[PDB]
Design an enzyme around this catalytic site. Structure first.
Site, short mmCIF file in Angstrom:
data_model
loop_
_atom_site.label_atom_id
_atom_site.label_comp_id
_atom_site.label_asym_id
_atom_site.label_seq_id
_atom_site.Cartn_x
_atom_site.Cartn_y
_atom_site.Cartn_z
CG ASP A 77 53.81 71.29 -74.23
OD1 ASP A 77 54.96 71.00 -73.85
OD2 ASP A 77 52.82 70.52 -74.08
CG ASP A 117 57.35 68.81 -71.00
OD1 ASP A 117 56.77 69.54 -71.82
OD2 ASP A 117 56.71 68.04 -70.20
C1 LIG Z 1 54.77 65.47 -69.09
C2 LIG Z 1 54.24 65.46 -70.52
C3 LIG Z 1 54.96 64.41 -71.35
C4 LIG Z 1 55.59 64.75 -72.56
C5 LIG Z 1 56.30 63.81 -73.30
C6 LIG Z 1 56.98 64.17 -74.59
N1 LIG Z 1 56.08 63.80 -75.70
C7 LIG Z 1 56.73 63.67 -77.02
C8 LIG Z 1 57.23 64.93 -77.65
F1 LIG Z 1 58.10 65.58 -76.86
F2 LIG Z 1 57.86 64.71 -78.77
F3 LIG Z 1 56.24 65.78 -77.93
C9 LIG Z 1 57.59 62.45 -77.15
C10 LIG Z 1 56.29 62.56 -77.92
C11 LIG Z 1 56.38 62.52 -72.80
F4 LIG Z 1 57.12 61.62 -73.50
C12 LIG Z 1 55.78 62.12 -71.65
C13 LIG Z 1 55.07 63.08 -70.95
F5 LIG Z 1 54.41 62.68 -69.83
C14 LIG Z 1 52.73 65.13 -70.54
C15 LIG Z 1 52.12 65.16 -71.93
S1 LIG Z 1 52.26 66.84 -72.69
C16 LIG Z 1 53.75 67.39 -71.94
N2 LIG Z 1 54.09 68.63 -72.37
N3 LIG Z 1 54.46 66.81 -71.09
#
Ligand SMILES: C[C@@]1(c2cc(CNC3(C(F)(F)F)CC3)c(F)cc2F)CCSC(N)=N1
EC number: 3.4.23.46
Length: 380
Positions: free
Chosen positions: A223, A36
């Site tokens: 991101d 991430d």
């Molecule tokens: C930590 C966080 C986060 C990301 C994902 C990853 N999101 C996804 C992606 F990576 F595919 F975009 C699974 C849907 C999570 F699962 C949980 C979070 F708290 C917050 C939301 S935006 C971000 N860049 N990071």
């Protein structure tokens, strides 16, 4: 130049993120960890949540040290809470090093873990400024660089395709087999998120003509933890207006553009050519110099696989509005090899050797262009 052991070290399922294998503790406990670049904590499941394949068992690790401090981390759509400590960490398909890193042992969460996913923690690769609870909690990659000779940079090739996805995370360098053409670099505006500045937006070659400051209201970031291309409201309104026009040979419900309904075509009959390309000009390395990255409908029209009540090919419009600025997620990154050159405070883009395209159009990275007043594009 070439890091064969790290090629193809990422995996995932469509829409569920990209993960890398890591080990934590002594003896090593293997865990799959979501990569991430939009956060800065290394946080792992540490309790038997029913969704998790496995979790960090601190009682089994002789090198575990307790920081005796908790952290509560809310998001828009969920939250986790955990107990801070440190322990030895390695990346089996990464550099041959072991480091002592901060780890948040997640002991409570809501809408954080994904039912059916194969990862059980997150590796926040951004900077200390956005670490929780504050910037004294050193992020993983900062520890890695401080403790070893690994160069201060990493690169991501996210390949897309629930279908399986794959990609590469090259730690400490660049693998020139993962891209074609030249890398083009845009400055990291500030080390918190990987913040960049967009200076122009074109749909099918036609400029949107907004005050460019709008493109970066209140920031623009790169991101890997966000699936969509997220745009500020005012910009999303103009971009949709112009994409609707370019694609007006067919009509679609207002809800489709709003990500409130899917749209389906007969298996094999998706009209790619009726959708425009999208070009983002990014600030370049030199005064008055920019470059542009171009993505296809293949990137921003995303297959939805798990639709039990349909047999056709259904897609989600994957551009959406934001009140936290522009977010270049997977919709952008899957077209490119992206180089997080932290040592030089810049992000490189090159056409990805694995990106999805058709016989008529391909993703592109082109320059140099002349763009004036680019500093005015940044929001203060
Ligand atoms: C930590 C966080 C986060 C990301 C994902 C990853 N999101 C996804 C992606 F990576 F595919 F975009 C699974 C849907 C999570 F699962 C949980 C979070 F708290 C917050 C939301 S935006 C971000 N860049 N990071």
């Amino acid at each position: 130049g070439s890091f064969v052991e790290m090629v193809d070290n990422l995996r995932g399922k469509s829409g569920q993120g990209y993960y890398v294998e890591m080990t934590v503790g002594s003896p090593p406990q293997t865990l799959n960890i979501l990569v991430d670049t939009g956060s800065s904590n290394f946080a792992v499941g540490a309790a038997p949540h029913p969704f998790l394949h496995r979790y960090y068992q601190r009682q089994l690790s002789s090198t575990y040290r307790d920081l005796r401090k908790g952290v509560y981390v809310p998001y828009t759509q969920g939250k986790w809470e955990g107990e801070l400590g440190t322990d030895l960490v390695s990346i089996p398909h990464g550099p041959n090093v072991t480091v002592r890193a901060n780890i948040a042992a997640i002991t409570e969460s809501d809408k954080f873990f994904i039912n059916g996913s194969n990862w059980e923690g997150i590796l926040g690769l951004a900077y200390a400024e956005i670490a929780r609870p504050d910037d004294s909690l050193e992020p993983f990659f900062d520890s890695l660089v401080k403790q070893t000779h690994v160069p201060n940079l990493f690169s991501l090739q996210l390949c897309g395709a629930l279908a399986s996805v794959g990609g590469s995370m090259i730690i400490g360098g660049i693998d020139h087999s993962l891209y074609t053409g030249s890398l083009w670099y845009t400055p990291i505006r500030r080390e918190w998120y990987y913040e960049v500045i967009i200076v122009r937006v074109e749909i099918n070659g036609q400029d949107l003509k907004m005050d460019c400051k709008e493109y970066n209201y209140d920031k623009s970031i790169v991101d890997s933890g966000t699936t969509n291309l997220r745009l500020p409201k005012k910009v999303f309104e103009a971009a949709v207006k112009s994409i609707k026009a370019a694609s007006s040979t067919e009509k679609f419900p207002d809800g489709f553009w709003l990500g409130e309904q899917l749209v389906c075509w007969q298996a094999g009959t998706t009209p790619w050519n009726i959708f425009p390309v999208i070009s983002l000009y990014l600030m370049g390395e030199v005064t008055n110099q920019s470059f542009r990255i171009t993505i296809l409908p293949q990137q921003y029209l995303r297959p939805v696989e798990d639709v039990a009540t349909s047999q056709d090919d259904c897609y989600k419009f994957a551009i959406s509005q934001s009140s936290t600025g522009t977010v270049m997620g997977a919709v952008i990154m899957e077209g490119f090899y992206v180089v997080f050159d932290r040592a030089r405070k810049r992000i490189g883009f090159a056409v990805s050797a694995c990106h999805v395209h058709d016989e008529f159009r391909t993703a592109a990275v082109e320059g140099p262009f002349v763009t004036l007043d680019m500093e005015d594009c940044g929001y203060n």
